[PDB]
Write a protein that binds this ligand. Structure first.
Ligand SMILES: [K+]
Ligand SMILES: [K+]
Ligand SMILES: [K+]
Ligand SMILES: [Mg+2]
Ligand SMILES: [Mg+2]
Ligand SMILES: [Mg+2]
Ligand SMILES: [Mg+2]
Ligand SMILES: [Mg+2]
Ligand SMILES: [Mg+2]
Ligand SMILES: [Mg+2]
Ligand SMILES: [Mg+2]
Ligand SMILES: [Mg+2]
Ligand SMILES: [Mg+2]
Ligand SMILES: [Mg+2]
Ligand SMILES: [Mg+2]
Ligand SMILES: [Mg+2]
Ligand SMILES: [Mg+2]
Ligand SMILES: [Mg+2]
Ligand SMILES: [Mg+2]
Ligand SMILES: [Mg+2]
Ligand SMILES: [Mg+2]
Ligand SMILES: [Mg+2]
Ligand SMILES: [Mg+2]
Ligand SMILES: [Mg+2]
Ligand SMILES: [Mg+2]
Ligand SMILES: [Mg+2]
Ligand SMILES: [Mg+2]
Ligand SMILES: [Mg+2]
Ligand SMILES: [Mg+2]
Ligand SMILES: [Mg+2]
Ligand SMILES: [Mg+2]
Ligand SMILES: [Mg+2]
Ligand SMILES: [Mg+2]
Ligand SMILES: [Mg+2]
Ligand SMILES: [Mg+2]
Ligand SMILES: [Zn+2]
Lengths: 155, 98, 60, 127, 24, 206, 80
RNA sequence: CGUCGUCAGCUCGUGCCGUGAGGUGUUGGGUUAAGUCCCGCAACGAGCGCAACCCCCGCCGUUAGUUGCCAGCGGUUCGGCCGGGCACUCUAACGGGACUGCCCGCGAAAGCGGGAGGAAGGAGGGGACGACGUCUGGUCAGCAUGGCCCUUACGGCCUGGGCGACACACGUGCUACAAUGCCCACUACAAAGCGAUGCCACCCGGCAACGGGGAGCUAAUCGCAAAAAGGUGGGCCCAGUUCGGAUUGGGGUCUGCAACCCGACCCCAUGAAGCCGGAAUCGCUAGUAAUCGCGGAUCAGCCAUGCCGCGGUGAAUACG
């Protein structure tokens, strides 16, 4: 991207919750372009959340995402021989990209045999404030500021 | 019921043999079923441009065999004449399975 | 093409197996296209001259 | 009496015949749900109708050939959208903004030479 | 997988037929 | 090494084939091997007539043919004594029994194949290359033509180091697929080795 | 997983030279260029020198080896 | 032919400047994918390049119906099967169509940012096409060619070996390590191609490879033909395991004069390593990557997991 500024491409709203944020999560889940299988997995998850929870899955989904979004992160920058971990804000766009990516990654780290259970349970532990996803988010933010000494290298 | 098969390599050489057979028969036979297209059969030849190595160059060549149908119903004797010795194309081949 | 191994025209292979295409123009024995009897090199040479009827440059 | 569009996508031809009725949809002599058996996407195919409050005021006989089911689903998406305008040309005033009238032009890019898959280039070493 | 001679997908990949993939 | 043969590149438009005979996957290779045998002889002798082109049409054992030369007479002969021997040389080659028309090249200086042959000969007689080229481009440019160019290979003048002499005038847009440019290539044996000669003439656009 | 079909192959060079040589009985040595040929019953006891491309190796044929080609006893290459 | 590369750029004619090499033009502001265009200039123009003219894909219309329809109707062996019709879909020739034209905003202009119509905008998407030249680059084993050398052998014919060797090292790939998976069923939806000494429907025998026998096709009529991934159902439960199929033993089918060295293919056994890969490092900006299968050339057969194409499903991300 040396010329333009590659504009964010819009996604087709969910075929159920009619949410773009959902298609997104589905895309991350998807592997080898098997968007059907991807779709099913996510849905059985919204279902499993309906089960163990008397709350609309869509609301749980959101909440979860929100808790995994990193509002700060460290970025490497070479200055004077060595490389310094410079902490800096995180654009909204990237927070979303990061939150969803981590949810799926954290979810697939889980122990439950069935894919749907994993996303479901990860999504829950997420909106709760726990789970491997939220840790990554926290281990990152802890990383930032832990290097606030270099915050003047704004970047 | 005259089955007419026209094949070739030029799509003008054939359309110039489906015209010397479309009007020179609408004055002695049925209203005739216009020249019918018929999908082509392409044959690709992919060759490595250079004499030695360089297997990543390659150029593409092909032999496109166009087709035509016509099919004039009602031989009528008089039709089988306006179309006896009144053609022109040299890069064409004709067939008749009436 | 070693004008002596161009005994392919022999037709008396003892066993039809030993029969091998071989170029009609170069003697080139390794890329002889059945349809043209030519090798990939000459097949490209003549096609450029328009001496191979119908054969054009494909593109899509 | 009857209205019809077409719609095509990624090489999938769709013949759409809309006739007033309940809401039944026949795809190749099969229930909509029969043809698109368990394809989360399918739902989409009829989005144009819902885009103008039809569906429950129409019925549709659909033909299809060429491609894959999701591609066919997109074609159907256009047919229904076209006929739905032939019925009433004032419907464009709504389907346009949703781009339901547009024929997605995206197609399988050609496979180039010296390249595994059109763009994917071969991997090399010790350079 | 595609490498299992005596299996369904195995025969397909190897472009053959047999007990594990008859011609209907 | 770049640039496709400007003819093979323009077969689609501005430039027809040199054999308009159809065939099927069983005979094509034969009727082809035949044409070559034909051009093989035609050129092996009619050299002196200066043969620019040689078309070959067919319909079924009635092998049309033709031969566009600059000096018809050389073909014909006393009344037609040569055009006789040869005409029989064709059916003796291939018991096809075929015609053998003769078109005259209005101007042998607007036919790249000749212009090439031209310079190619001079080279063997030891004419100064650069001159020939300069001149040749003129002959072509004087007698019409919106552009022209000539290229000789290397060992120019018997030199050990192979070079490449240029020379060209007017337009010669090879990238423009419509130029209608005649291209002619002439070899050129020599005591010390081969020299290649290419000729380009741009005449009319659309 | 061996194979050949119905019609065991054996070059007739040595064949009509062996089954015929069985008339008087046996003999010392033979010399063939038919690795191709299968070893058949009527050879047991013979000593067929096989060519390997450079040499004519002396192969003593036995019951247990009836079925194997002659080439299998005349190794082509030379390693360490 | 490859390469620097589709990177822009390389030049000329006359004039002007300089004793001269050589400058100016081609520099400079704006703009473009571009020496693209604009404005300005001792320069005015031009040539090879850029672009355009050619091909493919996207929308619509003519002309044309032994492929399409029952859309329309009437016969039904309820099979577009028959009548019948070109509407539709296709097939394939020819045209239309997009021009920053239209609207608002900025600008000296070119043009930039949006907005409306439109299938499609501002190079629609992909090809073909690669300047003056460089590498003293590749190739005398494709051919052609100067010189040199051998001309009972550096020529020629065979049979058999070899190019397939194996302590070892690297490149490119294939199949995997599994549950977003592997099986077995059962069901769908492709596109481009190939088919006389051939594709091979269908029938019989064989677990099968394949063998008998034979319908139709010189193929939009018949055949390769099943597409696979998917979808429904069922099994496996997390294990070197219903993951993975390497090795090796045995029995066979084929092609071929002939499968030891040295062929694929089938069936029963065997069931290796591998649990996701150190330092390093590769591809790709969207129908692209990833993934799924299908056809071709060569060719008897084949060591195709190569190669050249085809279509299905279909992302992530680009601050800068
Ligand atoms: K274009
Ligand atoms: K050189
Ligand atoms: K796989
Ligand atoms: Mg030679
Ligand atoms: Mg052979
Ligand atoms: Mg051949
Ligand atoms: Mg779906
Ligand atoms: Mg693909
Ligand atoms: Mg297995
Ligand atoms: Mg460019
Ligand atoms: Mg000057
Ligand atoms: Mg002066
Ligand atoms: Mg200068
Ligand atoms: Mg100058
Ligand atoms: Mg300059
Ligand atoms: Mg200059
Ligand atoms: Mg300057
Ligand atoms: Mg610029
Ligand atoms: Mg320019
Ligand atoms: Mg200027
Ligand atoms: Mg139309
Ligand atoms: Mg160009
Ligand atoms: Mg080198
Ligand atoms: Mg060198
Ligand atoms: Mg080798
Ligand atoms: Mg590897
Ligand atoms: Mg059976
Ligand atoms: Mg292990
Ligand atoms: Mg196992
Ligand atoms: Mg073998
Ligand atoms: Mg495991
Ligand atoms: Mg293939
Ligand atoms: Mg083959
Ligand atoms: Mg092998
Ligand atoms: Mg293969
Ligand atoms: Zn050749």
């Amino acid at each position: 991207a040396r010329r333009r500024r590659a504009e964010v491409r819009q996604l087709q709203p969910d075929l159920v919750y009619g949410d773009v944020l959902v298609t997104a999560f589905i895309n991350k889940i998807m592997r080898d372009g098997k968007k059907n299988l991807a779709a099913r997995i996510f849905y059985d998850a919204c279902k499993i959340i309906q089960e163990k929870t008397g709350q609309e899955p869509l609301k749980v989904f959101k909440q979860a995402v929100e808790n995994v979004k990193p509002r700060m992160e460290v970025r490497s920058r070479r200055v004077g021989g060595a490389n310094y971990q410079v902490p800096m804000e995180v654009s909204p766009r990237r927070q979303q990209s990061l939150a969803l990516r981590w949810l799926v990654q954290a979810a697939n780290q889980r122990p439950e045999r069935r894919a749907a259970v994993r996303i479901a349970h990860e999504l829950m532990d997420a909106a709760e404030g726990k789970g491997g996803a939220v840790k990554k988010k926290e281990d990152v933010e802890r990383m930032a500021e832990a290097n606030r000494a270099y915050a003047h290298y704004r970047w | 019921k005259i089955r007419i098969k026209l094949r070739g390599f030029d799509h003008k050489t054939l359309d110039a043999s489906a015209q010397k057979i479309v009007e020179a028969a609408r004055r002695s036979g049925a209203q005739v079923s216009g020249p019918i297209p018929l999908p082509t059969r392409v044959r690709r030849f992919t060759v490595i441009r250079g004499p030695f190595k360089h297997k990543d160059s390659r150029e593409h060549f092909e032999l496109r065999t166009h087709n035509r149908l016509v099919d004039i119903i009602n031989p009528n004797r008089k039709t089988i004449e306006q179309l006896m010795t009144l053609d022109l194309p040299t890069g064409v081949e004709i067939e008749i399975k009436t | 093409a070693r004008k002596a191994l161009i005994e392919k025209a022999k037709r008396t292979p003892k066993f039809k197996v030993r029969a091998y295409t071989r170029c009609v123009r170069c003697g080139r024995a390794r890329s002889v296209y059945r349809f043209f009897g030519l090798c990939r090199i000459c097949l490209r040479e003549l096609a450029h001259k328009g001496q191979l009827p119908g054969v054009r440059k494909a593109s899509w | 009496e009857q209205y019809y569009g077409t719609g095509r996508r990624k090489e999938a031809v769709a013949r759409v015949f809309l006739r007033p009725g309940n809401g039944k949809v026949t795809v190749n002599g099969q229930d909509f749900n029969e043809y698109f058996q368990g394809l989360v996407r399918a739902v989409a195919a009829l989005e144009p109708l819902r885009a103008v409050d039809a569906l429950g005021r129409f019925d549709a006989y659909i033909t299809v050939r060429g491609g894959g089911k999701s591609g066919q689903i997109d074609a159907i998406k256009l047919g229904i959208a076209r006929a739905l305008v032939q019925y009433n040309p004032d419907y464009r005033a709504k389907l346009k903004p949703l781009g339901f009238l547009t024929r997605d032009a995206r197609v399988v890019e050609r496979k180039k030479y010296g390249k595994h898959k059109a763009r994917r280039a071969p991997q090399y070493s010790k350079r | 997988g595609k490498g299992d001679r005596r299996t369904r997908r195995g025969k397909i990949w190897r472009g053959t037929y047999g007990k594990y993939r008859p011609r209907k | 090494g770049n640039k496709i043969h400007p003819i093979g590149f323009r077969l689609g438009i501005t430039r027809d084939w040199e054999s308009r005979w159809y065939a099927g996957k069983k005979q094509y290779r034969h009727l082809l091997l035949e044409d070559q045998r034909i051009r093989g002889l035609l050129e092996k002798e009619l050299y002196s007539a200066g043969l620019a082109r040689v078309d070959i049409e067919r319909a079924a054992d009635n092998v049309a043919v033709t031969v566009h030369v600059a000096k018809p007479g050389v073909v014909i002969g006393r009344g037609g004594e040569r055009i006789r021997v040869l005409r029989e040389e064709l059916a003796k080659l291939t018991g096809k029994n075929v015609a053998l028309n003769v078109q005259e090249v209005q101007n042998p200086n607007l036919s790249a194949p000749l212009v090439a042959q031209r310079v190619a000969e001079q080279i063997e007689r030891r004419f100064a290359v650069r001159r020939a080229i300069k001149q040749a481009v003129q002959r072509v440019m004087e007698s019409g033509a919106k552009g022209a160019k000539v290229i000789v290979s290397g060992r120019i003048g018997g030199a050990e180091q192979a070079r490449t002499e240029w020379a060209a005038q007017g337009r010669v847009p090879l990238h423009t697929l419509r130029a209608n440019i005649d291209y002619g290539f002439a070899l050129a044996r020599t005591t010390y080795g081969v020299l290649g000669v290419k000729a380009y003439i741009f005449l009319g656009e659309v | 997983p061996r194979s050949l079909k119905k019609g065991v192959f054996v070059d007739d060079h040595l064949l009509e030279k062996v089954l015929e040589l069985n008339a008087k009985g046996e003999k010392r040595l033979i010399k063939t260029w038919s690795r191709r040929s299968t070893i058949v019953p009527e050879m047991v006891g013979h000593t067929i020198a096989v060519y390997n491309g450079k040499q004519h190796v002396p192969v003593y044929i036995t019951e247990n080896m009836v079925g194997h080609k002659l080439g299998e006893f005349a190794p082509t290459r030379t390693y360490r």
